[PDB]
């Protein structure tokens, strides 16, 4: 194994203002931390023991029509609800939340490699403080499920393919994280093996934009 | 005549799960905060009414915490948590880092901010005060206010058991989901408070008091 056995999997989803060339900004973030042991067909229930963090974040630029349509969030409404920007205080919060998880820790996000990870890297890079994620590992769950399954690889398509019922989470970062968790609990042992074999340092994720 | 502490801009629905009843000097095993802006509550839309949909914009924190002492049998059965299991899953104690985490979470919420917990005055608030008192940080809850939703709902209804489940079932005509779990009970509380949001907010504004005035459960 490249980096030992992952002790925590943190299921992650970011929602944002638009697609990568638009130089988007995060508008919502959910982390759901699960211990390796809590992982080790009826849709699986989440483990009893989990840590969860879900935050709405005011962006500096407007959401695109499509972004607002899909995420149900807009810059205007985030500001009327007094949401703060992606800022130093947020980094304090993330660092403390990460500190409570046993290490090595691995982020897991659907399409993380092409979207969530580089965007997170970019948001954290503009802060004065070093990234709270520099000791953390990551994997993309699209690749994971492609390997476990050997077809659409959208989140809902996978879920329905495995469980033969429609997904029932909200259209939110947390809803997407919960659906992802369910999918990852389909073959938990095999998923953990794939994660262990394929985990890579978040510090090697290239920022989406600079 | 004016409000004691202005209009609350954020309500933070809160639930604590613990190792036992108050005389056992219990320790927190799970904590959930769900922060909702005043405007999100007010924007909340028969007999029975549909269970209100939670607002699109919310912040949520849920954490499991290893206690220093074992859970009582009843506690483990009710909450689904045990000291042993929390430990096999690498959970950390209630410590300074946790206070910092809570502070940073609270900092993202517009002020004045008011915690709302069911039986909070008798249990959740004094227990939380006690846990925080053993840390080396200032209280993260300085400047934050608190109220007990039992008194709140008693008032709203008067305009009967007052356990969380009894109220929910009275208003919506079906049982809650995920009782005895911190997040589950928070969500149930949110649904109850969304029943009559304007009246709830008014009662909260008038009865909010500083968390700093809450007496610790034990020394």
Swiss-Prot record, chain A:
Instruction: Please name the top-level EC class of this enzyme.
Output: hydrolase
| Record text on activity regulation | Calcium, lithium and sodium inhibit the exonuclease activity but not the DNA binding.
Give binding positions for substrate.
15-16, 115, 176
How does activity track with pH?
Answer: Optimum pH is 7.5-8.0.
Q: Which residues carry this modification: Phosphoserine?
A: 64
Describe its membrane topology.
Answer: Peripheral membrane protein
Name its cellular compartments: Nucleus; Cytoplasm, Cytosol; Endoplasmic reticulum membrane
The regions listed as transmembrane in this protein's record are none
Identification of the protein by name: Three-prime repair exonuclease 1
Q: Which residues of the full protein are shown?
A: 6 to 234 of 314
């Amino acid at each position: 194994l490249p980096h030992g056995h992952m002790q925590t999997l943190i299921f992650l989803d970011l929602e944002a203002t638009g697609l990568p060339s638009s130089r988007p900004e995060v508008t919502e973030l959910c982390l759901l931390a699960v211990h390796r042991r809590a992982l080790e067909p009826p849709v699986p229930r989440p483990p009893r023991v989990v840590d969860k963090l879900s935050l709405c974040i005011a962006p500096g630029k407007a959401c695109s029509p499509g972004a607002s349509e899909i995420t149900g969030l807009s810059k205007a409404e985030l500001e009327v609800q007094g949401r703060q920007r992606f800022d130093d205080n947020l980094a304090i919060l993330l660092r403390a939340f990460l500190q409570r998880q046993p290490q090595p820790c691995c982020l897991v996000a659907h399409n993380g490699d092409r979207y969530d990870f580089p965007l997170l890297q970019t948001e954290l890079a503009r802060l004065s403080t070093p990234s709270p994620l520099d000791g953390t590992f990551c994997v993309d769950s699209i690749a994971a499920l492609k390997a476990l399954e050997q077809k659409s690889y959208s989140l809902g398509s996978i879920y329905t393919r495995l469980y033969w019922q429609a997904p029932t989470d909200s259209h939110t970062a947390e809803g997407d994280v919960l659906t992802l968790l369910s999918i990852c609990q389909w073959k938990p042992q095999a998923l953990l093996q794939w994660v262990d074999e394929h985990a890579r340092p978040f510090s090697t994720v290239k920022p989406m934009y600079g």
